[PDB]
Amino acid sequence: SAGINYVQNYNGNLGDFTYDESAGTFSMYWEDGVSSDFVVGLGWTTGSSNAITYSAEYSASGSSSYLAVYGWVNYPQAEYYIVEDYGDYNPCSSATSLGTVYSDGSTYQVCTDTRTNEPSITGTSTFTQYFSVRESTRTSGTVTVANHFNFWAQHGFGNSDFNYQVVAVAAWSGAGSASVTIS
Numbered sequence: 001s002a003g004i005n006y007v008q009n010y011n012g013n014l015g016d017f018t019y020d021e022s023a024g025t026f027s028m029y030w031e032d033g034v035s036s037d038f039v040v041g042l043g044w045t046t047g048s049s050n051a052i053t054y055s056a057e058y059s060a061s062g063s064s065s066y067l068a069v070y071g072w073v074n075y076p077q078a079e080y081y082i083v084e085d086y087g088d089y090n091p092c093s094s095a096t097s098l099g100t101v102y103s104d105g106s107t108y109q110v111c112t113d114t115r116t117n118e119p120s121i122t123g124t125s126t127f128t129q130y131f132s133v134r135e136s137t138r139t140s141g142t143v144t145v146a147n148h149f150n151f152w153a154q155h156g157f158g159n160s161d162f163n164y165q166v167v168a169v170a171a172w173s174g175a176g177s178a179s180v181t182i183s
């Protein structure tokens, strides 16, 4: 419409991935469970601080999984997740804590860590990860991206030179199912 021009499809063939760029809808099924890591979703080839409104039916109980706003910064290279709902794994349990940000009716746990020679948008490289994890989880609403971006910025996040930006469903162990719409 508004406004999808990018499809995220990292190892989506681990499960069952269907999408519609025009409708702004995608679904992902991994009920048989997943052996490896996948990240799928819809969005834009260049991200911004514009708010994202999403609606999703998300079932990832007993699954290391995220329903999240997902994207990259080109340089310095950074990967980010604004996690709205998740399964059994919270990234801020092991990662370096950055504190708390408040956005859109809930506090988010903010944490960071550094991946060395891991799969990236530039093949395989060293990059910083930024996580925002919602305290009281939801599967629909508006993500004020600007709020998270500005908070991360105070901790080294580039806050410019963005690559793609998507509403994504990710999982790397266990079983689940998801269906999403981007307003």
Ligand SMILES: O[C@@H]1[C@@H](O)[C@H](O[C@@H]2CO[C@@H](O[C@@H]3CO[C@@H](O[C@@H]4CO[C@@H](O)[C@H](O)[C@H]4O)[C@H](O)[C@H]3O)[C@H](O)[C@H]2O)OC[C@H]1O
Residues within 6 Å of the ligand: 013, 014, 015, 016, 029, 030, 031, 032, 033, 176
């Ligand atoms: O329209 C909706 C239908 O799509 C949904 O129908 C079925 C729901 O279950 C879906 O199945 C998937 C199938 O893929 C598994 O994945 C494969 C897993 O093993 C891998 O080796 C392989 O590469 C993958 O392709 C996944 O675990 C499992 O969840 C099935 O596709 C659907 O069509 O029914 C309701 C309708 O509203």
Ligand SMILES: O[C@@H]1[C@@H](O)[C@H](O[C@@H]2CO[C@@H](O)[C@H](O)[C@H]2O)OC[C@H]1O
Residues within 6 Å of the ligand: 010, 037, 038, 039, 118, 119, 120, 121
């Ligand atoms: O766009 C793709 C990225 O999604 C992928 O990044 C990995 C996705 O899974 C995450 O758990 C990892 O932290 C991350 O390295 O890299 C390949 C790229 O094409």
Ligand code: NA
Residues within 6 Å of the ligand: 051, 052, 053, 182, 183
């Ligand atoms: Na939107």
